[PDB]
Amino acid sequence: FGNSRADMEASGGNSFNGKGGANASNTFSGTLTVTVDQVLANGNLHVVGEKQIAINQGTEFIRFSGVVNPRTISGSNSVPSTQVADARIEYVGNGYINEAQNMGWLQRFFLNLSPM
Amino acid sequence: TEFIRFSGVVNPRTISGSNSVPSTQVADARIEYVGNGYINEAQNMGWLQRFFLNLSPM
Amino acid sequence: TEFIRFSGVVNPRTISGSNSVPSTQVADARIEYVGNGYINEAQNMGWLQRFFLNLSPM
Amino acid sequence: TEFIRFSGVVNPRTISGSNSVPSTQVADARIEYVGNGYINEAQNMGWLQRFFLNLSPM
Amino acid sequence: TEFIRFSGVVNPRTISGSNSVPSTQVADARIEYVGNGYINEAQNMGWLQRFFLNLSPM
Amino acid sequence: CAWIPAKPLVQGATTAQPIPGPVPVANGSIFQSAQPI
Amino acid sequence: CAWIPAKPLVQGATTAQPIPGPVPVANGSIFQSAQPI
Amino acid sequence: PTGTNMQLKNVAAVMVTASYPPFARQGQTIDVVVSSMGNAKSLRGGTLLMTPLKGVDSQVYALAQGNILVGG
User: Which domain of life is it from (chains B, C, D, E)?
Assistant: First the structure.
């Protein structure tokens, strides 16, 4: 053991920390009158509807489609949208207000093709 | 001049006793609220701005 | 555009009086909540980042 | 995408009146909770780090 | 992946009415709680450290 | 390293198709019991 | 060092398949007891 | 619904006992004895709903349903 023949000092360390996650949310609130355009074999009604509103400087379209079971309709001839089987709900618009919410073609290309 | 236009299909049994129906009970509701004059002309984007809004890269 | 898809096997005796069943009573529950458009494209890692996440030493 | 898998042996007399049994009453309980996508790929150690974790002296 | 293994000899008169017995009433209790993956690999001493722990003078 | 094929913990099929039941016998009874265990 | 094969503490099989039971005798009784211990 | 209060007065939970006769064939009828199981005042004019009579081997050997005759 003389002359530091066994005298030693060593150290080591290893670390790792990974994490991840995601979340999605959506909300919709409104009232729309639709029309029955087909009555199915079991009595269910295929319903389609559209409401168009032009306020000042644009046009908004609210479209709905689905299948409604008649026994879910309330006494006021109304049914919540969560009781419609094939719910297709659309809320779009046109005009420069809508054109201002589309990404520029170059930005929309860099969003897909840029390395990072 | 302001124009308020409406169109749709109304079910008679939805009409109240005062001969009135809310606009949410009309099937094909088409509601329009527009105007003219310089007040309306002041709310349209300039042709060059309206072109850069569509054709500028970002 | 957002798509919410569901699939599974439901035992009829689990359905409540309001023709409703919680999703935890469905045997082969397949629940999907996806979307498209640039909002969805903004939540995908860049191809180079997604490659370095798999092939970088550390 | 997340996958929750379960397997085991259930004694019928342990099942409650609501057709439910706690997971601690299942004999050969195999419970799995995994996922894929870049969120899962971000929780795997890099191959070089995973090698140094096993072969480095300290 | 975590594995919890148990083995032993149970006297039937120790089993309660809910078909359950505490682990201290099992004669040859063999209880094991292990795991694998890099989380487990991170709790093993490095071969050189595990050698110095046994062969170093002090 | 996440692309390496791996064997899941719960191997096999994670679903079972209900088997159709035996055809009732022609004894004049409504109660019909499959091969009893 | 974690890759070294090791023998677990609870060796053997950690499951037992229930053995099918004896065929009841033809004595006119519902109660049938397997070979009693 | 699972969360609800039902407070019945015309229903009693009972145990039904019977004897499986020698050489019994399916379709024949036997007598049963109906005995109340919890805090029921009487079974005067009750009707026994469909009840499967199990054996020692926990197999259904008879199906019970009828009108109970209480002495009075």
Answer: Bacteria
